[PDB]
Amino acid sequence: TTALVCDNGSGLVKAGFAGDDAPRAVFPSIVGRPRHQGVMVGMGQKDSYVGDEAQSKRGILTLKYPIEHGIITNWDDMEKIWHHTFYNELRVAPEEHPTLLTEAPLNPKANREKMTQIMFETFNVPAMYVAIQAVLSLYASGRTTGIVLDSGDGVTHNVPIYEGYALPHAIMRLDLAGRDLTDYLMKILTERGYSFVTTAEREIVRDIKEKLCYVALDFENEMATAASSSSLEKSYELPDGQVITIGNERFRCPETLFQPSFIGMESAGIHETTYNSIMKCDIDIRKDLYANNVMSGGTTMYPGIADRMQKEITALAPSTMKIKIIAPPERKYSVWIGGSILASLSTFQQMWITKQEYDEAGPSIVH
Amino acid sequence: TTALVCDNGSGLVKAGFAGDDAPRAVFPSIVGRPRHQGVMVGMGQKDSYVGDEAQSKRGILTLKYPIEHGIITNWDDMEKIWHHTFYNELRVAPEEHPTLLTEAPLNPKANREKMTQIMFETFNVPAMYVAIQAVLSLYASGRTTGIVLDSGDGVTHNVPIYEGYALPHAIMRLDLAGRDLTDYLMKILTERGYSFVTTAEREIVRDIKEKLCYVALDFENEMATAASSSSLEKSYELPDGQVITIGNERFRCPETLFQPSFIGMESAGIHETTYNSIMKCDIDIRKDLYANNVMSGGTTMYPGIADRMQKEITALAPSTMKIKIIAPPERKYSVWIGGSILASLSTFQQMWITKQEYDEAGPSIVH
Amino acid sequence: NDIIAAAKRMALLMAEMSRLVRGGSGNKRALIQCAKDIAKASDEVTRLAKEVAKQCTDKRIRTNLLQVCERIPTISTQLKILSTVKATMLGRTNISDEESEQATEMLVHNAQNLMQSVKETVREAEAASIK
Ligand SMILES: Nc1ncnc2c1ncn2[C@@H]1O[C@H](COP(=O)(O)OP(=O)(O)O)[C@@H](O)[C@H]1O
Ligand SMILES: Nc1ncnc2c1ncn2[C@@H]1O[C@H](COP(=O)(O)OP(=O)(O)O)[C@@H](O)[C@H]1O
């Protein structure tokens, strides 16, 4: 009957029926085979625990995020994601709902083909459409011009769209944020003597990354005021009771977004990808991308973002130009709220692929 | 035809058919050859008295507990134990009952092989399974997460198991308690001027260890109130009518469990092996070990345990992190009550060894 | 649909058990029986899951269903044994009231875990009927 808007979220897979409220299920996904020997009689235990239970039960498993820098390394686990979700989360048969899948703005061939082909034959969804993720937040943002910044663990992207034609000469995929920010944070968590280094042990870090990191007004003076004794330190309580007091690194980690010099990695800050993308768009259009800059993805929820970003862009940007950054609340469900609108657009159900026509035309139609 | 749950108790060997209450046979193991010349002609008397007659006939024999450091010293006496129990206690054919044998958590190779191999070839047991002692107490404590303390004369052990994957890198065998506590107790029984030197004379000590000893709340302060004249002394009556009045040593002996520097053995108090074993386990799991600490073995019956243990651990333990150590009444049959649960589980009867696979596959891959 | 029925029955037995354990020494025989009645019901859940598993067609779901139902016997066996021990333990005055309370608590924890195992089984059973 009803369509299901299903986002292959980078994190943080999101699922919820077509509108108007929220994803029924959002979860970090994760599959983990159990690292330690079992002495349970039965044994009676899942071959791999998927999320959620593997994020209640960490450690006795080996967590594997299946989508590595946006690339689905084995779809065997992806299919198990789909099946687990559809059956034991959302509780539905894929044959019943025409589905909507999302993908990234730029991904290699045949990532979307192999997905599409397997998903049609395995789950036998009757009809489908596969959207690049940035575009759905455009429909979500309800703006008619502007550059979309889609940032989740572990792949960011920067897409310029004008009314209502895309800007191919300016599409940027940055592989930077966020799992590497997680790894970097872990590297500066060794600096406070806490070595939660194993892959599983990383998840807690991600939670301190959610909750405790902050973004400053400007680096140099926050580095200065860090030299001031005044307590930037915030206390995390750890799942063994331990209390961790972090501060310098607390504003240090996000600064990477402005300056990748911390990782070193040879890509420029959002600052420059903005400028350089704007300066790969036509002059006339440069007027209206300025003040239609749209950030996204759950990671962007750090309060000094965007006005750090604003102030940084204003420094490189030409004088008197109107620069304004559009920031939704709860950007993690931005995408999902995009998707809901799309699949609702009649008559563009008849621009959704249908299994019989797929039977006739195979992967050729996909592109 | 019914299975027999038969425990190689380090005490206090325990045997009883499957369920539902207790072992039908419990005995302190002992075989003893007669130290003195028999003059009443013939004399129709056994080469060695097994228990119970050897605990009537203390002293005219030389008592030998066969499991030495928990290891079967010679199977000549062990097999005679097995036969004595099966025929002359339980009154059952080893050929008839599928049996269940228990073993310890950690022992050298090949004592369980050699045991099994001899037991299959000598008693021609049709089917068998051999369990480590800690695990049976988990089913005997209806738990599936936590650290198990298995303490009998003279080997204690410390096993962490988590829902229900075991932590090998946290399994500790301490040879500390309790038979050395018996030996130390005898040494501080010389302080009240009564000699108990011989092998036999040690049993009476064990009985005063059962009945008379107690555990305090804090050593320095119990030592303080011991200096107070007030009646701490308890009067034992001895088999030649003698009245022994013990008090200081009455709380002193068990306190050794928290302080082995008293014996002098380098090994650390159960307190510290607990903390260090908890702190040899993964962080997240530390949360559910705190309050799933299970002590066991008949020795653990001393009233200052466990809140002594609690109070000591809480001084080293993380702040405001809930812990509870309490374990069942009647811990000596805890294990036995374990065994009953195990062996009833079909189909895991077919995870027992069968004589045909013993014939075909010998004692390979026993471990 | 006896699985939904059994799940509701299990909940009613657990609501009653919670009530019995708030009551006195007069609930001794009832507690032993409560554990017996729970054990009969678990044997029915296990049985139904094995019958449904035979008619099931997707290997993953069948396996996942088999994984969860195989722990139910062991918990039900532990309940019968631990109840027999606790039952025989009542009526003795040498053992401490705190230790006795802890036996009631442990039994409650085990019952809660049994109920959770059934809860997970119900969740998987509900999902399996789609395919
Ligand atoms: N308050 C927060 N602060 C920082 N990071 C956050 C916060 N809340 C969520 N995140 C991050 O958001 C990421 C998910 O982004 P998402 O919106 O799922 O991107 P996408 O849809 O492109 O996959 C997660 O990896 C998570 O760590
Ligand atoms: N009331 C008691 N106080 C202290 N020790 C006791 C008491 N009752 C029995 N014991 C001890 O219990 C020990 C047996 O423990 P057991 O349960 O057989 O351990 P295991 O099964 O690991 O071999 C005996 O060596 C005996 O001295």
Ligand SMILES: [Mg+2]
């Ligand atoms: Mg994205």
Ligand SMILES: [Mg+2]
């Ligand atoms: Mg033992």
